[PDB]
């Protein structure tokens, strides 16, 4: 509708059968059929997800903390959990994906053990 400047030509949509009825110049027809053929190609916000296994940490416990820090990384950001296989589902842009990987790789460490020997002597 704004392809022609402020109308002349017209444009009519069909959202059930996805049809386009355009009433105008033939070059706008040709160039916008080419933009249609470039336009019906898949592009971004597609396959920008991530699955993270966790070690030595629960998924929901870290998931509350990542959800509470992920406001500052926000155009959308989604970290949800799974307590069955202890995994973490990320949905973010790849910079935010790398930042959350930097969070996760510094929060999943093997902890340390102590052997305590207490001894009691009485005479």
């Amino acid at each position: 509708n704004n392809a022609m400047s402020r109308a002349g030509a017209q444009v009519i949509a069909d959202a059930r059968t996805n049809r386009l009825i355009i009433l105008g110049p033939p070059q706008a027809r040709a160039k916008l059929v080419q933009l249609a053929q470039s336009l019906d190609t898949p592009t971004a916000r597609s396959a920008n997800t991530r699955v993270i296994r966790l070690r030595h940490n629960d998924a929901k416990t870290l998931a509350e903390t990542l959800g509470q820090i992920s406001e500052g990384m926000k155009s959308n950001i989604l970290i949800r959990a799974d307590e069955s296989t202890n995994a973490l589902v990320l949905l973010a842009d790849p910079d935010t994906v790398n930042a959350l990987e930097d969070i996760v790789r510094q929060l999943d460490v093997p902890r340390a053990q102590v052997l305590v020997e207490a001894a009691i002597v009485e005479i």
Binding site: R53, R55, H56, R111, Q113
Partner: protein, 83 residues
């Protein structure tokens, strides 16, 4: 065995004998985590007082949480008592 014990007479059932309760947590690889609650009870006929069954309901009762390696015989607990 499974024995009664008085909570008053309002007795109750309670298990006596070798026992083990494991809960693992498994990494994709080495260094498993274990939450062990192992015990060995017994029951005593010798030193009986003026009261009920002197049930040795713990004779060992180690309730620990360790982190082991998948082929390594390790030591969890001990007691050396000299007199």
């Amino acid at each position: 065995q499974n024995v009664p014990f008085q909570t008053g007479t309002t007795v109750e059932r309670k298990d006596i004998g070798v026992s083990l309760k494991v809960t693992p947590h498994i990494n994709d690889g080495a260094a498993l985590r274990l939450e062990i609650e192992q015990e060995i009870s017994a029951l005593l006929p010798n030193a009986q007082q003026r009261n009920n069954t002197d049930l040795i309901t713990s004779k060992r009762s180690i309730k620990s949480t360790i982190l082991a390696e998948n082929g390594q015989v390790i030591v969890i607990g001990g007691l050396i008592q000299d007199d």
